[PDB]
Design a protein around this ligand. Sequence first.
Ligand SMILES: CCCCCCCCCCCCC(=O)O
Length: 133
Amino acid sequence: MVDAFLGTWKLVDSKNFDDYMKSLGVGFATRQVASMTKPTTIIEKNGDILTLKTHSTFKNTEISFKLGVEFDETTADDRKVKSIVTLDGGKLVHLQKWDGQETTLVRELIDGKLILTLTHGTAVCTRTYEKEA
Ligand SMILES: CCCCCCCCCCCCC(=O)O
């Protein structure tokens, strides 16, 4: 049941995103721009296939996947990873693997807001998105 995640979402709060980016090795100038960017995330489904778009003034990404089926992904910061997205506890959990490393991108709904928790190494970032009409 992915349906309450679907729609267009705008970033309205960010905590520790610089720590997360730095853990991934993102360079200072990119982190600087990213710290001032408010992406729009669009999540849509067509049958079993989800498409997740991230749009900003800096950098755009798009992925399509089936829940529970691995896919190749090239992230915004140009990591080539093996990914899987699943529902776990009502949360949409995206796991990326590369070079023996892992990062998780966990989405959940709290009071109608989309909370994205990003973990890599010891870095834990929390970003909050609110839905666009
Ligand atoms: C080139 C710009 C790279 C910026 C850092 C990207 C890190 C991985 C993706 C983070 C996604 C955050 C979000 O969807 O709010």
